[PDB]
Amino acid sequence: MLDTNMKTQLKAYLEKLTKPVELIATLDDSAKSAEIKELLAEIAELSDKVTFKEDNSLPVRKPSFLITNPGSNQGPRFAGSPLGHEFTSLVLALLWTGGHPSKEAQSLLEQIRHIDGDFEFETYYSLSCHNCPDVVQALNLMSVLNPRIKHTAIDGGTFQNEITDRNVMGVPAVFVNGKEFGQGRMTLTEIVAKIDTGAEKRAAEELNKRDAYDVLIVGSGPAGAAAAIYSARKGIRTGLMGERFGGQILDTVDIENYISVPKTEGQKLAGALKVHVDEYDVDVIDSQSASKLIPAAVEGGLHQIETASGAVLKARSIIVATGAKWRNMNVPGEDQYRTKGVTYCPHCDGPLFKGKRVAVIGGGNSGVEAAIDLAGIVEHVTLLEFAPEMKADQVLQDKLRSLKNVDIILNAQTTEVKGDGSKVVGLEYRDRVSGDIHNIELAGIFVQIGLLPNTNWLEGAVERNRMGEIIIDAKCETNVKGVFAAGDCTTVPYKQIIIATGEGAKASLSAFDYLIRTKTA
Amino acid sequence: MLDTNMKTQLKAYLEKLTKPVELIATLDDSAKSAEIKELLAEIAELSDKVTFKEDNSLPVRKPSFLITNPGSNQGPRFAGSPLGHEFTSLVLALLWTGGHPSKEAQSLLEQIRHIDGDFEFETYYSLSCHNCPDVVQALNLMSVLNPRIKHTAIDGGTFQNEITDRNVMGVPAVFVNGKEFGQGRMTLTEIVAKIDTGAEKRAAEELNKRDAYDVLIVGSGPAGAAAAIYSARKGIRTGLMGERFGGQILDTVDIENYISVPKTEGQKLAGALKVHVDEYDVDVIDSQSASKLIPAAVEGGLHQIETASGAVLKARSIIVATGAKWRNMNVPGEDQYRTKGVTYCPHCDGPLFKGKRVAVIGGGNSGVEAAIDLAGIVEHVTLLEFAPEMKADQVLQDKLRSLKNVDIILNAQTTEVKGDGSKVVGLEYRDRVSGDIHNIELAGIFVQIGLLPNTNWLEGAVERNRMGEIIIDAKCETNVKGVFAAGDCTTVPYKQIIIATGEGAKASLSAFDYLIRTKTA
Ligand SMILES: Cc1cc2nc3c(=O)[nH]c(=O)nc-3n(C[C@H](O)[C@H](O)[C@H](O)COP(=O)(O)OP(=O)(O)OC[C@H]3O[C@@H](n4cnc5c(N)ncnc54)[C@H](O)[C@@H]3O)c2cc1C
Ligand SMILES: Cc1cc2nc3c(=O)[nH]c(=O)nc-3n(C[C@H](O)[C@H](O)[C@H](O)COP(=O)(O)OP(=O)(O)OC[C@H]3O[C@@H](n4cnc5c(N)ncnc54)[C@H](O)[C@@H]3O)c2cc1C
């Protein structure tokens, strides 16, 4: 039922065919079936690339035909007349099946190819339906890109029959696997959303496709945040990635040494950092965890970060700001009395125990230095050391043994933190030698057994000291060009919020200075 | 008119006399005069240390007598009867004149000796006056300690005459130099205040007498303040001295990079630092200027700071935090448009000129680096260099010559900053070669001619680099033990508030670590 212009115009399009096309028909003795036989022979006529063939014993619509390549059973099937407004759809299904390319978003297309679930679409149209082609053409394209997406297009002029049976009251009307999918004007983009629950992952492929950063900051505590603020203010493209925005300050309550602010709270401060961050153009990336640094192979290259989630981000410069973890005793009551008398930091919380008894756990330099600090402020200090002797510098031991409100206990292993449901009232320990159990009354317990930088994931990539800290010069430079570090994860001597933010700012200004010094066209 | 017990009791006191005493009398033919002749002979009788003598031709009260040493005319004069309630006063004037010491505050006493103005006190008393001795004894003491303080004590029983003439209506009644001084119960301490306007200076001697500090921080900008906060929280004795609390932040308006605080103001922030400081036990000392450091001569000693005002403060540890000054162009309009388009700091104020034209003054690394920064953010940058060529690193010059929104001008000397009464609209300069004058339209002018640390006053005391910065290691340690430095006055690579506070905190924790490591009984 091709007219003069469709025939001549189709001859033009058909010479685009790089591949062989077969139209496989399944037909009864109906007038319409003859209508369709005729049509297919008319098209086979117009190119040696197209051959027409019958198989009338197949479990499908009569009349219908498949458009495929030789040997495949993959491609769009029309049932009824593929003309009317759908002539362009017919041409197009032929063209694609014979290797003319889609006009579409290539990315969308590869998305379609790699899709797991099975699917059997069916669209209802009528020849006069001005809107049905885009939808038909959309879903035809799918059947060609992936064999697990079947698509039959149904002309309602033939099966006025079936329109009734599924009570379709308006066309185009799409169905998936028997279930009603939707109707009216749906672009390819919208159908593909609806269909694939898909990979949730691609924040992942989403990360992989983002552009290289001028600077990418890893770790979003105080240090990383300060870095980000200083970076974005120079207008360079900046990314701040980390596991959990706020870092260690999220798990603290009272903070009295964030200079200028007499008293704030961990949560308030983390939120105030977020707000200060969001004033600038910063790609903030939360709950991602860096698992490797790949240093640039050349002086104008890109550094790369891998994430535990599998993604790879790229940057001209990196700032690592992953902080550290204070070693826990791991004993019953510890978790329960964090911030309620169990603390990890004498500078932070010392003044809160004037008049009170406290313990320090750890006989290293950390603890011993902590006990002398606390001794000056508190009514009494007990230091518990796990081993038979203290690890501290002798000159610190002497000094701590000099004082008159301190007790040192050796071989002592804390077994329990004791509170009253609200706050610490004591401590329980074991003599590791005798196995006997002892009890102390106190209000504060300062754990000073060790810091652990969050830097194992950099082994071999940048240089660390013997405690895991990333070595930096005053400019926050590591031993790899273009890679900087700030905060508790570095060799910086003291671990504090106001110190962390400062280093962050420094690292960023060094990063900027590096970027501008390094280009050479 | 001495009775048995006064005579015997006075014999006891008189053997305390280490020095010779003379009582010089001036007398008429009155009964009272005879009363007084008698009395003086009775006392001369009681010790060979006391001789009595007459000179009846003297321009003074009759009867009166002076109590002095041989040859002097210095000491207290009584007129009328020195008995009654005033017997103890008489004894005491004799004792002091013969070298028994005062019961008083020695410091108060030396204060009295060194006092410049002349003064002629006169006190009115009556014998029955129970309160007059303390006052009489007070002012007698003065006449002995300093010859420019005269004091006659007047018994109103003799000159009931004079009581009338000066309408004294209640005793004790003191007079200075004819003028009425006051009356009733005045301790020595209160008379001495009233009398000497004195040295205002002694904040000065007041500083000199204060106890050694555990730590003394010099300079009270952001860095010194942070140091002080961290120090006092360890409860050590801490002093913060500086020229003007707040440092450079007092002369700035908008601050958008004090991390966590999106927008504050110089004045607000300085005040918020003061408040955070005053939460702790910190001796704050304002408007004092350090002019020299004297390093301890031994490892447990004291460092000393001299002040321009002459005082010397002492400390076991020092933190220098004296900051820096940005070089001014020194041209008309500069002062007028500070904070209104003339600025000293691209990191600080860069984002405020998006879309605007600006100039950078200075072709060093500072300026050149600034111009590249600004180039990325602003519509156009002009750099003016005073000399025939830029001092910047070649690699920075190339990079700045690469850009498409920058102009470089050589031999250019800015003559005027032009505003509209409210903000900068342009700039005027001189070609130093031709002498011709040029004009530029712009909104911002970034002066980058040089930083000058405020450290000349340390020449020879601690090591500085070739730009005057105090050299520090990561722990803020200088090349003198126990001396630390923080902030813009050091080698720290970038000059910012948040960086300054961090260093301050670090310096303090290092100072503390030094104190506790250094004692050895
Ligand atoms: C309970 C407690 C109380 C404290 N109280 C005070 C106080 O009163 N005053 C004070 O000055 N300081 C206090 N501190 C210390 C202060 O919180 C830290 O020194 C500071 O938070 C360190 O800043 P930072 O950004 O360098 O590191 P962090 O705060 O440790 O932040 C680093 C961030 O990076 C994340 N990260 C780690 N590894 C990775 C990775 N591989 N990839 C991505 N992200 C990663 C971490 O999860 C964290 O979110 C306290 C600390 C604790 C634990
Ligand atoms: C106009 C202007 C705007 C700025 N804007 C910003 C901004 O938006 N953001 C930002 O991060 N930074 C900004 N800064 C920079 C910031 O103010 C400084 O980096 C910071 O104040 C330095 O801190 P500091 O305590 O080390 O030194 P200072 O702030 O310089 O303070 C040192 C103090 O010590 C005093 N002192 C000096 N010599 C002596 C002596 N011999 N004895 C006693 N006292 C002495 C000084 O008078 C001063 O009071 C700006 C600076 C200026 C000038």
Ligand SMILES: NC(=O)C1=CN([C@@H]2O[C@H](COP(=O)(O)OP(=O)(O)OC[C@H]3O[C@@H](n4cnc5c(N)ncnc54)[C@H](O)[C@@H]3O)[C@@H](O)[C@H]2O)C=CC1
């Ligand atoms: N200001 C300075 O220069 C400082 C230097 N340092 C140095 O850096 C490193 C860090 O020192 P520290 O943090 O003290 O580490 P450390 O390993 O030297 O000290 C840890 C201590 O904890 C003890 N311990 C472990 N588990 C215990 C438990 N459950 N109960 C009681 N005690 C337990 C160990 O016996 C040891 O004495 C050290 O090598 C030290 O020399 C430490 C702090 C500051």
Ligand SMILES: NC(=O)C1=CN([C@@H]2O[C@H](COP(=O)(O)OP(=O)(O)OC[C@H]3O[C@@H](n4cnc5c(N)ncnc54)[C@H](O)[C@@H]3O)[C@@H](O)[C@H]2O)C=CC1
């Ligand atoms: N990131 C880094 O490593 C940095 C390094 N530096 C170094 O530290 C030092 C500080 O550098 P700068 O502050 O740039 O000092 P500088 O002395 O090198 O630069 C000052 C410049 O100002 C110019 N100048 C002076 N008065 C002028 C006026 N009225 N008008 C116009 N121009 C005028 C001089 O000709 C000179 O080019 C330098 O020695 C530099 O090498 C400087 C900045 C940062």
